[PDB]
Amino acid sequence: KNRIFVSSSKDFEGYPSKAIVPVQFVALLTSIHLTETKCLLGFSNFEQEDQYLIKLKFKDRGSERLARITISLLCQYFDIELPDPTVILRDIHLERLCFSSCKALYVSKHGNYTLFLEDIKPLDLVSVISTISTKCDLNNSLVDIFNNLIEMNRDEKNRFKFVKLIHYDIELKKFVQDQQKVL
Amino acid sequence: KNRIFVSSSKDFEGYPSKAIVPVQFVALLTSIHLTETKCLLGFSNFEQEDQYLIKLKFKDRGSERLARITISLLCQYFDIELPDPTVILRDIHLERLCFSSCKALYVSKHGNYTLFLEDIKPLDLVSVISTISTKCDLNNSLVDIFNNLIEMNRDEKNRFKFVKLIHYDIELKKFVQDQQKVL
Amino acid sequence: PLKLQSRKLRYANDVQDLLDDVENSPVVAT
Amino acid sequence: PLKLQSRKLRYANDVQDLLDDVENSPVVAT
C-alpha cells in the first residue's frame, strides 16, 4: 500500500480538501468518549494537549457491540477501569501511560476531515523503555513523546508527574533518571 | 437484566426453538476463523474438544474493521501472534492458555441456534491461579476447566502438555503440582 | 423523545438481523 | 468472480459512507 506516516497533527494541513488517505501515527491514549451513537479516541504526542481525535463509526447495534468490545479490550490491555451508556475518560496519561501505534484513514471533504480507526496496536511500556534504551519513524516518535513527557514532569505547574502514575515502576523511575542525563 | 449462566454447551438443549436469550460462560479460547465475511471464535471447557463457537457478525467494511481490531486486541492481550485475509488458528491451548469470561446472545430459530458475541473479558492466568488457590459460577467453571486440563496432561496420548506452553511459568509449574495433591 | 425513537428502531432492526442470520446460516443446526 | 463482486460493492459503499459522514459531522472543521 502507501500508508503515510504522520509525526504531528499539523501535517494534515498539506492534505487534500477531499481525499481518502491511509495514515499512521504514534501517541499516548488520553481520552475516550463512548456514546450509543459514536466513539472518539483522543491521542497526543504532547508536542501539551489533545491532538489526534480518532473516530470509531457505527450505526446499527451489531457494530455498536463491536465498538464496545474494542474499547473494553483496549482499556483492559492498559489496566484501565471501565464501567460496563455514555462513557467518558480524560487525561488518562496523568494516571497511566498508554503508548499506541495507530493506523487510520484520513477522510476529508470541503476542507474538513475525520480520522477513522483502522487498527490500534498498544505498546508495552516495558518495550517502549527498552526500545529507547538499547537504541525508525516509530522510534523517533517514541523518543519525542518521552522527551516532552520529561519536560512536562520538570515543569512544576504541569499536572503530569511520573510518581503519580498508578504504575510507577522501579524500572520507570530508573529509565527517567538515566534519560534526563542525555539532556 | 436476566443473563443466564451456562456451564456447558449441552445446556442449550433446554433453550427455546426460537428465542433471544442473553447467556454467559467461561472457557479457554481454542480457535479463530477470520474471513472477510465472518468471524468465529471457538472456546472449550474441555469437559476434550471445541464446544462453544461464538460469532462476530459484520456486513459492511466499517463493521469488518471493528471485528479486525477486536481480534487484534484479543490476540495481543494473550500474546498470540497475528499476521495482519482469511486467518485461522487452532488448538491455541496447546501453546497458550487463554481463559475468558464471555457474554453472548443465544439466537435460535427452527431449533437452530447461534451464539453472537456481546462481550469478552480475558482473564489473566496469574489471577486464575490465585483465584483458585486462595479459594461462584465463574470459580466453579475455572476449577472444572483446570481439573480437565490436569487430566489431559496426565493422559500420555493427549497432545496437551503444560511444559509445552510457551508461557510455562515457574509459578505455573508450582500451581499444577500443588493442585494434583487435591486429587 | 428523539434519542428513544432511534433506540427502538436500532433494537428492532437488530432483532431481525440476528434472527435472519440464524435462519440463513446457523452455526449450530439440528 | 462472486467474491469479487461483493468486495467491489462493500468497498464502494464504504467510500460513500465515510465521505457522507465527514460531510454531515466532521471531527475537524475549518
Swiss-Prot record, chains A, B:
Q: Which residues of the full protein are shown?
A: 13 to 224 of 924
Write the protein's name. Answer: Cell division control protein 13
Instruction: Describe its partners and assembly state.
Output: Interacts with POL1, EST1, FUN12, STM1, STN1 and TEN1.
Which source organism? Saccharomyces cerevisiae (strain ATCC 204508 / S288c)
> Could you say what the effect of mutating residue 38 to Q is?
Increase in length of X' and Y' telomeres. Disrupts interaction with POL1 but not FUN12
Q: Which domain of life is it from?
A: Eukaryota
- Give compartment(s): Chromosome, Telomere
- Additional notes on this entry: Present with 319 molecules/cell in log phase SD medium.
What is the purpose of this protein? Answer: Single-stranded telomeric DNA-binding protein that regulates telomere replication. Has a role in both positive and negative regulation. Promotes [TG(1-3)] strand lengthening via interaction with EST1. Promotes [C(1-3)A] strand re-synthesis by DNA polymerase alpha via interaction with POL1. Negatively regulates telomere elongation of the G strand via binding with STN1 thereby inhibiting telomerase activity.
From Swiss-Prot, chains C, D:
Q: Which family does it belong to?
A: Belongs to the DNA polymerase type-B family.
Q: What is known of its domains?
A: The CysA-type zinc finger is required for PCNA-binding.
User: What organism does the UniProt record list as the source?
Assistant: Saccharomyces cerevisiae (strain ATCC 204508 / S288c)
Reported effect, residue 23 to K: Increase in length of X' and Y' telomeres. Reduced interaction with CDC13
Q: Where in the cell is it found?
A: Nucleus
> Could you identify this protein by its name?
DNA polymerase alpha catalytic subunit A
Q: How would you summarize the oligomeric state and partners of this protein?
A: DNA polymerase alpha:primase is a four subunit enzyme complex, which is assembled throughout the cell cycle, and consists of the two DNA polymerase subunits A POL1 and B POL12, and the DNA primase large PRI2 and small PRI1 subunits. Subunit B POL12 binds to subunit A POL1. POL1 interacts with CDC13, POB3, SPT16 and MCM10.
Q: What does this protein do?
A: Catalytic component of DNA polymerase alpha, which in complex with DNA primase (DNA polymerase alpha:primase) constitutes a replicative polymerase. POL1 has a role in promoting telomere replication during interaction with CDC13.
List other remarks.
Answer: In eukaryotes there are five DNA polymerases: alpha, beta, gamma, delta, and epsilon which are responsible for different reactions of DNA synthesis.
- The modified positions for Phosphoserine read 25
